[PDB]
């Protein structure tokens, strides 16, 4: 007895979300990827509602999603790393109202294996290279370039293998017209499998390794690797080069740290704590997501905790050295897996469990009543939550 599999309703589970000019004009679209469905949707700036333009299926789980553009261009591309065991670069075609296959490179077997690149994906902000790395020992780097045919080109992959290494996160460091640099969180475990006493399992720190891409000798080597104090989960890139300093924003447990290569001090500002918490006072506090609103005039950052509280990270510097980090409670929203700070004062929040919201920004949070925190204050901060008073709800999915 044969069976025919039809469908009635498509999955609405959001896992990743990116924003950019995927069409070509001066309008920003959102590419939201479901579990195994690639979707495109844009909001109307005049009424606020959101429409659907494409619901193409990829027939396979997606483990990463990134967007980038070439230097001196006006179109945004999509890089997808998935269980397929390959790397795919897409392109949106408004005339055909469908995606366009461009490149396809094979670098291993298929399946969610251990040593298979595809989990962590990072791209150069300037748009000159891309790094796809596995959970262990299978770091791989490509070199993107443009030729006289005005078409994207892919060179041979460059291996950066390292045995007995676990990777927590990979981010691309912003450098102004220099060699590309990438950061990762390695942690060796070779010594932990040779001591039966088990003392080597503890007191084992993880390092912040920076990888140097030699654009003249065509090889990748690691330069800096320094141990850390406590474990972190994810990193936030800082716009550098000519607009702001260059570095990372490691978000460890109950702390946020800024570290830069070379000679530069470190800043550790404890995360603010809710006033009169009713929970057990032995549970750590960590971040779940972030955002970036880089602008030529001024830039800030966003974050969200386990309870769903949006903060506002602002860095302080004079020429290159970062002096202090100034946190400030922004609003309270349901816990989400990704955010997209849209232009024209629009914010998109994609909840991990429930409906999906879309808010607009009326005030940027200037000259407020609540105080702002900093790392200069000695010594367990507190704050009082309240209604929004800064955002309004205009659409719900």
């Amino acid at each position: 007895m044969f069976l025919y599999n039809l469908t009635l309703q498509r999955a609405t589970g959001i896992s990743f979300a990116i924003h950019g000019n995927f069409s070509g004009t001066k309008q920003q679209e959102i590419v939201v990827s479901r579990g195994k469905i690639l979707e495109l949707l844009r909001p109307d700036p005049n009424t606020g509602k959101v429409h659907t333009l494409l619901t193409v299926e990829v027939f396979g789980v997606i483990r990463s999603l990134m967007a980038f553009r070439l230097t001196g261009g006006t179109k945004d591309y999509i890089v997808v790393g998935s269980d397929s065991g390959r790397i795919v670069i897409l392109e949106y075609q408004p005339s055909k109202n469908m995606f366009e296959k461009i490149h396809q490179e094979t670098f291993g077997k298929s399946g969610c294996r251990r040593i298979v690149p595809g989990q962590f994906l990072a791209v150069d902000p300037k748009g000159r290279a891309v790094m796809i790395s596995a959970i262990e020992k299978q770091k791989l780097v490509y070199i993107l370039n443009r030729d006289a045919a005005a078409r994207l080109t892919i060179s041979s992959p460059l291996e950066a293998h390292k045995a007995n290494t676990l990777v927590y996160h990979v981010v691309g460091v912003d450098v102004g017209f220099e060699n590309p640099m990438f950061a990762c969180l390695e942690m060796d475990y070779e010594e932990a499998d040779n001591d039966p006493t088990g003392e080597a399992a503890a007191n084992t720190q993880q390092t912040l390794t920076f990888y140097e891409l030699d654009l003249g000798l065509n090889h990748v080597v690691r330069k800096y690797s320094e141990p850390l104090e406590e474990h972190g989960n994810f990193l936030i890139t800082v716009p550098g080069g000519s607009d702001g300093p260059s570095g990372v924003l490691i978000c460890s447990e109950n702390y946020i740290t800024y570290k830069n290569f070379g000679d530069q001090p470190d800043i550790r500002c404890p995360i603010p704590r809710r006033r009169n918490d009713l929970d057990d006072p032995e549970r750590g506090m960590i971040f779940v997501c972030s955002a970036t609103h880089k602008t030529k005039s001024m830039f800030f950052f966003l974050a969200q905790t386990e309870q769903g509280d949006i903060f506002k990270i602002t860095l302080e510097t004079d020429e290159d050295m970062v002096t202090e980090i100034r946190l400030k409670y922004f609003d309270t929203v349901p816990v989400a897996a990704a955010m997209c700070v849209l232009k024209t004062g629009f914010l998109f929040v994609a909840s991990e469990f429930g409906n999906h919201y879309l808010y607009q920004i009326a005030h940027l949070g200037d000259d407020d009543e609540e105080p702002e925190f900093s790392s200069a204050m000695p010594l367990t901060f507190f704050f009082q939550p309240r209604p929004l008073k800064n955002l309004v709800l205009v659409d719900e999915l």
Partner: protein, 71 residues
């Protein structure tokens, strides 16, 4: 020799392999595969009232030395 391909891939055993290093690889592969499928993590995050980031962090932390210390 046909053992060239089997050697470059980690997790490959031989005639003198002890149970402990087989089970630690068995647990590590499962831990890695947990973060791959999205619904396999949704089930874990619904079973215990936690967030996806917390479950991912715990799974990453548990990979340093699963199945206890060796003998």
């Amino acid at each position: 020799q046909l053992e060239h391909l089997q050697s470059k891939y980690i997790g490959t055993g031989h005639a003198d392999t002890t149970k402990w290093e087989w089970l630690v690889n068995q647990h590590r592969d499962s831990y890695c595969s947990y973060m791959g499928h999205f619904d396999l993590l949704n089930y874990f995050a619904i079973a215990e009232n936690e967030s996806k980031a917390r479950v991912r962090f715990n799974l990453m932390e548990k990979m340093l030395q699963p199945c206890g210390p060796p003998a």
